[PDB]
Amino acid sequence: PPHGLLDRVITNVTIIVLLWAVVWSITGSECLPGGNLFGIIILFYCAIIGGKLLGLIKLPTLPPLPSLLGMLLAGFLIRNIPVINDNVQIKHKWSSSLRSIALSIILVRAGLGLDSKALKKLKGVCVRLSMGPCIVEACTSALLAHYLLGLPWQWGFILGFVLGAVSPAVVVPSMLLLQGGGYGVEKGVPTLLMAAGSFDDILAITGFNTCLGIAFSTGSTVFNVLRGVLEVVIGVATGSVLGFFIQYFPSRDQDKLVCKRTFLVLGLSVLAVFSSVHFGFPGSGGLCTLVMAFLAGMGWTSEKAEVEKIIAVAWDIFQPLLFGLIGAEVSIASLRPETVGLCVATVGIAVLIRILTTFLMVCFAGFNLKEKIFISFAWLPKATVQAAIGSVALDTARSHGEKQLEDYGMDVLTVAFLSILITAPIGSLLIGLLGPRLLQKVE
Amino acid sequence: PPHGLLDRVITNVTIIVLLWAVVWSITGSECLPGGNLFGIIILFYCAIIGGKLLGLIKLPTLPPLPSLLGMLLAGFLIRNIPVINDNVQIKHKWSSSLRSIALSIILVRAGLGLDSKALKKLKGVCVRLSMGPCIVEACTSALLAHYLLGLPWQWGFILGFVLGAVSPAVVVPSMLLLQGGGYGVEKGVPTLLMAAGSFDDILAITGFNTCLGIAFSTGSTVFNVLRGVLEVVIGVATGSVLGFFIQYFPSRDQDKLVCKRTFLVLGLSVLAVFSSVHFGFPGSGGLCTLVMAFLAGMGWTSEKAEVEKIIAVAWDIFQPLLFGLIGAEVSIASLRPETVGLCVATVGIAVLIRILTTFLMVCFAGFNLKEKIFISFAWLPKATVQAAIGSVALDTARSHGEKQLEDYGMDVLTVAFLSILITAPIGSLLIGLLGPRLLQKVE
Ligand SMILES: CCCCCCCC/C=C\CCCCCCCC(=O)O[C@@H](COC(=O)CCCCCCCCCCCCCCC)COP(=O)([O-])OCC[N+](C)(C)C
Ligand SMILES: CCCCCCCC/C=C\CCCCCCCC(=O)O[C@@H](COC(=O)CCCCCCCCCCCCCCC)COP(=O)([O-])OCC[N+](C)(C)C
Ligand SMILES: CCCCCCCC/C=C\CCCCCCCC(=O)O[C@@H](COC(=O)CCCCCCCCCCCCCCC)COP(=O)([O-])OCC[N+](C)(C)C
Ligand SMILES: CCCCCCCC/C=C\CCCCCCCC(=O)O[C@@H](COC(=O)CCCCCCCCCCCCCCC)COP(=O)([O-])OCC[N+](C)(C)C
Ligand SMILES: CCCCCCCCCCCCCC
Ligand SMILES: CCCCCCCCCCCCCC
Ligand SMILES: CCCCCCCCCCCCCC
Ligand SMILES: CCCCCCCCCCCCCC
Ligand SMILES: CCCCCCCCCCCCCC
Ligand SMILES: CCCCCCCCCCCCCC
Ligand SMILES: CCCCCCCCCCC
Ligand SMILES: CCCCCCCCCCC
Ligand SMILES: CCCCCCCCCCC
Ligand SMILES: CCCCCCCCCCC
Ligand SMILES: CCCCCCCCCCC
Ligand SMILES: CCCCCCCCCCC
Ligand SMILES: CCCCCCCCCCC
Ligand SMILES: CCCCCCCCCCC
Ligand SMILES: CCCCCCCCCCC
Ligand SMILES: CCCCCCCCCCC
Ligand code: NA
Ligand code: NA
């Protein structure tokens, strides 16, 4: 009987072709070249293959390049080459929905990992580094945007806020592995960097929106700023009652306990994220999800372990989709070759600023010198939020049909997209590599 | 903490509402009253609730009424009441696809249950009772249709063939439970009634089609009859090479063996059924599926057990859909109150004929008197095939815009639909009840 490497390769080859064939027969022409479902399948497979090649087969001689770069490049190539783009076209409604489900899963993993005791003695620090680096980065980037790019102050600040928000899709997967090995759980570094990801997106989007309106002179600053406060209050209130809801009603006397639990947390997480966007309170589905998952984890003292394993498997299926799609938005017709060298300057200097301010924010928390550096370098990655709100400024500029504001809009897109390419791949490397050396592994 | 019956009821109530809510938020207005996805969800839940009430809560005092009747009635009520019909509307493409997947799953379970040694010494019997009762039932029903209904000979024979084919969705689930208890595996009755379901549908559809064309004087009888022979040859040829394909390449040295195997058999089964319908050879996806699953089971000597458990769970999810949808095709505007009493006569007498001829076909197989009666009464149920091809004659009659042929078409629909209501519910009862008493349970 055939066996060994010959057996394994032919088993996967059929599955790839079968998974297309099975979907094709049921759905028909949607799963053929130029169809919505065809775009999803091979973007899934191109991202998976792209991830394997870079990290394992092509270039492992340097410090192991993470699969984030491979998936991000696979979407980049699919989008830009015209011969392979016209045959691969996912609709925007399916694009946002799949990314939102990826966001829903990652927050559930983040919520089910936070240590209650560790979060207790780290509350001022979580607030500081969530809103401290982001505001200073917003100002410092806006200072540079007014001089290196020449954008006015209003367009400087939307550039700052779009460049400010950290991404929990790069940090949380990396720090959960460190928590699995207990590399820093003595003092709470892994829980520090997974809980702070909530409020920085509320500040960034609220900062982006209220500074976007004043650039177009529509709406009022009072509601846009007050919305950000309301996102917090309804996020906790909805999240709190849902947290005690799941913590009791699936009880230890049922049969399909694990199956019923994992459906409840992730199903309500998907409900929270999509409904909040629909009803007009974006970002209240990420604070709700993180709160309800955390509280649900405090009643699931030791029986939460089986839940997160199923969530971990789901993330492995959605990571190629999320990062592959993100690279699929960046074109080269929305970027300007006149300004790429000094659009690296604003991103390059702002990262230096972001590292510097993150040092001071954590400088009074009892951590030693080494953990401050690790937190300083692990707060950089910026992937999901820049993709979500990068093109909003340019898209709104074209809707109003102005002239000069599209020139400003493209530069925001370049900074929003260059930030993903040069920070997220290097952010993942620093978290994985510097982790074991700096943090104190538990005896 | 809340517990007991209060805890269990509220856990399910949320899941029903959550499963609608989660789908609604992602999809939008499709999952609202008057939407395709809304029709599916509550048809799923109405069929499930309808099944529970009849068999357990409402009427268990009589011999336990099977859940087939409950699901069949739930679809019947949803279709006919106008206030609950306009709010529940599944599209035909989704209707056929979900029923075809249910057909694909049931044949996989049938294929993975056949005993190779038992099928060896029962081959003439399998051929006889597959084509013996069906042909005599086709003739006897056509004899009655020409007198009791008054239909001419051409419309008599399409009435015979639409009324001939047995259904493997009622027999196979019932006989697999008997095989689980080993109620008749000494001589091979369970394998006898699961393997014969293949060729009777090839004969019925081929008999239906070639007699349908001559009723409308289109096409030629040579190809329509020759198609039925070709369905057998390509069904085995495609099924055989696929059977040895799966039997080797997932080998005992892999990790996700069970997951990879169960995807292969059911994925290829779905591919076989849908592609054959698309390419124009219906029924070659049921013989292919039964053959490939059987051969795959002969290399999976003892490691096939874990596969069929996952298939069994999938069937429990698709049984409400299949039987609920079947009852959702039967209206009361396509039935004629002038002729229901004597349309029971043709169905009533034909069942008596079908039982009588099934006795003789099995009368020389070494079985004793008791097992012949059990096989005689377990060959009756007729649900899936009548639903699939019942309305084809009337639908084609309206397309040609004739006058008299719609009168003949409605009567075929009444017989095709009355056959499901009075044979399948009573067929399931006889298989379950008479089973333990007549068959010889293994010591
Ligand atoms: C919760 C209670 C329910 C219980 C669960 C049941 C839930 C369902 C679960 C399993 C059943 C699978 C669904 C079968 C029926 C849908 C398919 C279909 O008919 O699409 C139709 C429309 O489709 C569309 O136009 C929209 C695209 C989404 C289709 C469904 C997505 C999944 C398709 C893959 C399924 C995954 C495969 C399995 C996993 C690998 C196709 O029609 P068409 O596009 O017009 O083609 C004609 C093209 N032409 C016009 C150009 C000629
Ligand atoms: C936006 C998305 C919303 C959410 C999406 C859903 C995501 C999550 C959904 C599902 C993922 C969770 C289930 C994973 C598989 C089971 C793994 C498992 O842990 O078993 C668990 C239960 O399971 C069983 O006991 C086996 C029987 C399962 C049948 C229930 C059907 C579920 C699949 C239907 C799928 C529909 C398919 C058709 C759809 C077209 C636990 O059993 P155990 O491990 O043996 O331990 C015993 C537990 N005990 C000790 C407490 C007693
Ligand atoms: C294989 C490799 C890929 C990896 C796996 C990924 C595969 C996917 C797996 C999980 C992701 C779930 C899919 C998310 C994106 C699709 C939803 C969507 O946007 O539909 C859109 C279209 O949809 C349609 O019009 C056709 C209907 C089928 C939609 C998909 C079926 C499943 C929807 C439930 C999903 C199951 C929930 C979870 C289980 C409980 C909705 O747009 P709309 O209808 O126009 O709304 C506007 C209405 N209006 C115009 C009137 C205003
Ligand atoms: C038309 C339809 C086409 C077909 C449809 C597919 C139907 C079937 C598909 C899936 C059903 C089969 C899987 C059921 C769940 C596992 C149960 C199981 O038996 O585990 C098995 C493997 O599984 C594992 O080892 C656990 C890890 C699974 C990850 C693989 C992802 C599969 C889910 C992705 C779903 C996509 C979700 C997102 C989609 C939007 C066996 O592990 P074990 O029991 O521990 O025994 C050890 C085995 N051993 C001894 C040989 C070593
Ligand atoms: C086991 C692998 C099976 C592959 C089947 C491929 C069938 C593809 C047919 C495409 C024809 C397109 C018709 C519109
Ligand atoms: C949002 C999409 C949900 C997909 C969940 C898939 C679950 C797969 C894990 C099942 C494996 C159970 C044994 C570990
Ligand atoms: C999405 C359709 C089901 C896919 C199941 C198998 C998942 C394949 C990707 C998982 C990651 C593999 C490399 C770690
Ligand atoms: C846990 C149960 C949550 C139920 C949420 C129900 C939300 C339904 C809102 C429907 C509004 C329709 C807007 C078009
Ligand atoms: C055609 C639709 C396929 C749906 C398959 C669902 C599989 C559910 C069974 C998983 C349970 C695994 C442990 C018994
Ligand atoms: C179809 C969406 C997933 C459903 C999972 C739970 C299955 C519910 C029906 C199973 C039968 C329950 C009564 C035996
Ligand atoms: C450890 C051997 C695993 C073999 C998988 C690599 C081959 C996959 C081919 C996918 C096209
Ligand atoms: C993901 C593998 C896809 C294999 C088929 C490619 C599309 C073929 C369409 C018909 C030429
Ligand atoms: C000086 C012109 C106005 C520039 C916009 C300032 C926005 C500051 C942040 C608002 C939250
Ligand atoms: C009776 C089992 C209840 C738990 C599973 C229900 C939801 C399944 C996931 C739906 C996608
Ligand atoms: C000021 C009240 C807002 C109405 C509620 C709509 C938003 C729902 C948020 C769900 C997380
Ligand atoms: C053995 C107790 C199980 C409770 C389930 C029955 C209540 C379900 C309510 C569904 C609406
Ligand atoms: C299967 C339970 C469905 C609960 C909601 C019914 C539809 C409500 C639509 C908005 C009135
Ligand atoms: C005597 C008129 C022709 C009636 C049709 C006979 C069909 C017999 C079965 C064909 C396979
Ligand atoms: C690497 C796991 C391969 C087995 C599972 C692939 C198919 C999953 C089912 C797709 C619906
Ligand atoms: C006479 C040759 C028919 C062409 C093959 C198309 C049918 C494929 C059947 C798949 C089971
Ligand atoms: Na964040
Ligand atoms: Na049959």
Q: Which amino acid is at B222?
A: V
Q: Is A182 left (phi over 0), alpha (psi -120 to 50) or beta?
A: left
Q: How far apart are CA A6 and CA A4, in angstroms?
A: 5
With a 6 Å cutoff on the Cβ, whether A22 touches ligand 5 is: no
Contact between chains at B249 and A7 (C-beta distance less than 8 A): yes
CA A139 – CA A353 distance, rounded (Å): 10
> Rounded to whole angstroms, how far apart are CA atoms A76 and A332?
10
How far is B370 from B86, CA to CA, in rounded Å?
50
Q: Cβ(A94)–Cβ(A78) under 8 Å?
A: no
In this complex, the residue of A7, A268, A270 whose CB is nearest that of residue B251 is A7
- Residue A212 and residue A159 in one domain: yes
Given an 8 Å threshold on Cβ–Cβ distance, is A3 in contact with B253?
yes
Q: Which of A26, A253, A270 sits opposite B274 (nearest CB)?
A: A26
Q: How far is the CA of A273 from the centre of ligand 8 (A)?
A: 13
Query: Residues of B forming the annotated binding site for Na(+)?
Result: 166, 197, 200-201
Q: For residues A79 and A130, what is the distance between their CA atoms, to the nearest angstrom?
A: 33
| Closest chain A residue to the Cα of B266, Cα to Cα | A22
CA distance B161 to B344: 17
Provide the residue range defining the domain that includes A21.
Answer: 5-85
- A180 CA from centroid of ligand 12 (Å): 40
Q: Which ligand is nearest to the CA of B97?
A: 1
Helix A305-329 to helix A257-279 angle (10° resolution) is 40
Same domain, B10 and B98: no
Whether B18 sits inside 8 A of A270 (CB atoms) is no
User: Distance from the CA of B263 to the center of ligand 19, in angstroms?
Assistant: 7
Resolution of the determined structure in angstroms stands at 3.1
CATH number at residue B278: 1.20.1530.20
Give yes or no: residues A344 and A378 share one domain: yes
In angstroms, the CA B105 to CA B384 distance is 14
B443 assigned to some structural domain = no
Q: What share of chain B is helix, strand, coil (3-state, %, to 5)?
A: 75, 0, 25
Subunit contact A271:B15, Cβ cutoff 8 A: no
Is A200 annotated as contributing to ligand binding?
A: yes
- Say which amino acid occupies A161: F
Asked if residues B203 and B160 have their Cβ atoms less than 8 Å apart, the reply is no
At B432, the amino acid letter reads G
A90 domain residue, yes or no: no
Kindly report the number of other CB atoms within 10 A of residue B213's CB atom.
18
Which of A25, A251, A275 is opposite residue B25, by nearest beta carbon?
A: A275
* Ligand 1 and A30: CB distance under 6 A: yes
Q: In this structure, are A158 and A11 located in the same domain?
A: no
Residue A229 belongs to a domain: yes
Sequence-distant (6+) residues with CB within 8 A of A272 are: A104, A238, A239, A242, A284, A285, A288, A289, A292
Place of tokens 């109150």: B337
Contacts of A36 by beta carbon, 8 Å cutoff, 6+ apart: A30, A89, A90, A91, A94
Based on the domain organization, do B425 and B389 belong to the same domain? yes
Contact A14 B249 (CB under 8 A): yes
Please list every residue in chain A whose beta carbon sits closer than 8 Å to the beta carbon of residue B316. Answer: none
> Ligand 19: which of B101, B249, B256 to mutate, most ligand atoms within 8 Å of CB?
B256
Distance separating alpha carbons of residues B204 and B202, to the nearest angstrom:
6
The torsion angles phi and psi of A75, rounded to 5 degrees, stand at -65, -35
- In terms of domains, do B81 and B103 share one? no
B336: tokens are: 């004629």
Q: Does a structural domain hold residue A91?
A: no
Nearest CA in chain A to B6: A249
Residues of B contacting chain A (CB within 8 angstroms): 1-3, 7-8, 10-11, 14-15, 18-19, 21-22, 25-26, 97, 248-251, 253-254, 260, 263-264, 267-268, 270-271, 274-275, 278
Q: What b/e readout covers B342-379, taking b as 16+ CB neighbours within 10 angstroms?
A: bbeebbeebbebbbebbbebbeebebeeebbbbbbbbb
Torsion angles phi and psi, residue B98, rounded to 5: -70, -35
Q: At residue A216, what is the residue type? A: F
Placement of tokens 């540079």 in the chain: A144
Evaluate whether residue A270 is within a structural domain.
Answer: yes
Q: Do A264 and B10 touch (CB under 8 A)?
A: no
The answer to whether position B425 is within a domain reads yes
Using an 8 Å CB-CB cutoff, list chain B residues near A259. none
Ligand 6 within 6 A of CB of A273: no
Same domain, B72 and B117: no
Return the residue whose CA atom lies nearest to atom 9 of ligand 15. A276
Q: DSSP character for A302?
A: T
Report yes or no on A317 lying in a domain.
yes
Q: How were these coordinates obtained?
A: cryo-EM
- Taking an 8 Å cut-off on Cβ atoms, the answer to whether A253 and B278 are in contact is no
Dist. CA B145–CA A66, nearest whole Å: 73
Say if residues A162 and A184 touch (Cβ distance below 8 Å): no
Q: Are residues B128 and B183 in the same domain?
A: yes
If one counts the domains in chain B, the total is 2
Let me know: does B187 contact B367? Beta carbons within 8 Å: yes
Where does a domain end: B85, B109, B128? B85
In which element (H, E) is residue B434 found?
helix B404-438
Closest partner residue to A11 (CB to CB) among B21, B97, B250 is B250
* Residue A400 half-sphere exposure toward CB, CA atoms < 13 A: 16
Contact call for B3 and A253, based on CB within 8 A: yes
How far is the C-alpha of B68 from the C-alpha of A15, rounded, in Å?
35
Distance from CA of A24 to the nearest CA of B (A): 9
Extended beta strands in A293-375, E state: none
B310 in contact with ligand 9, CB cutoff 6 A? yes
Whether residues A262 and A316 fall in one domain: yes
Judge residue A180's burial from the number of C-beta atoms within 10 Å of its C-beta, 0-12 exposed, 13-18 middle, 19 or more buried.
exposed
Chain B hits for A253, CB-CB cut-off 8 Å, are 3, 7
Which atom from ligand 20 is nearest to the alpha carbon of B285? 11
Cα–Cα distance between A166 and A424 in angstroms, integer?
Answer: 10
Last residue within a domain, chosen from B53, B85, B117? B85
**In terms of domains, do A81 and A148 share one?**
no
Q: Identify the residue whose tokens are 């460190």.
A: A178
Nearest CA to ligand 18 atom 1: B153
Our answer on whether the CB atom of B108 is closer than 6 Å to any ligand 9 atom is: no
Six-digit token string for B424: 């399948």
Q: Report helix, strand or coil for A3.
A: coil
Min CA distance, B330 vs chain A (Å)?
25
- What's at B100, amino acid-wise? S
Q: Residue A289 in contact with residue A234, Cβ under 8 Å?
A: no
For B136, B155, B164, B403, the CA distances from B152, given in Å and listed in that order, are 18, 6, 18, 15
Ligand nearest to the CA of B26: 3
DSSP classification of residue B165: -
Residue B246 buriedness (CB in 10 A; 0-12 / 13-18 / 19+): buried
Q: Which of B298, B335, B312 is nearest to B420 (CA)?
A: B335
User: How far apart, in whole angstroms, are the C-alpha atoms of residue B282 and residue B262?
Assistant: 24
Per DSSP, which regions of B212-371 are E strands? Answer: none
Nearest-atom number in ligand 2 for the CA of A267 is 3
Is residue B339 situated within a structural domain?
yes
C-alpha span between B135 and A122 (Å, rounded): 81
Query: Tokens 């008299």 identify what position?
Result: B404
How many whole angstroms from its chain centre is CA B60? 25
Per-residue tokens: A363: 């400088």
A119 and A72 within one domain: no
Token duo for residue B419:
């056959």
Instruction: Give the residue from A46, A61, A85 where a domain finishes.
Output: A85
CA angle, A358 as apex, A356 and A364 as ends, to 5°? 110
What secondary structure does DSSP assign to A203-228, as a single string? HHHHHHHHHHHHHHT-S-HHHHHHHH
Interface contacts (A, B; CB < 8 Å): 80
Select from B2, B8, B25 the Cβ nearest to the Cβ of A271.
Answer: B25
Whether residue B212 sits in one domain with residue B99: yes
Integer Cα distance of A347 and A345 in angstroms: 5
Q: What ligand has the least distance to the C-alpha of B229? A: 20
On whether the CB atoms of residues A438 and A430 are closer than 8 A, the answer is: no
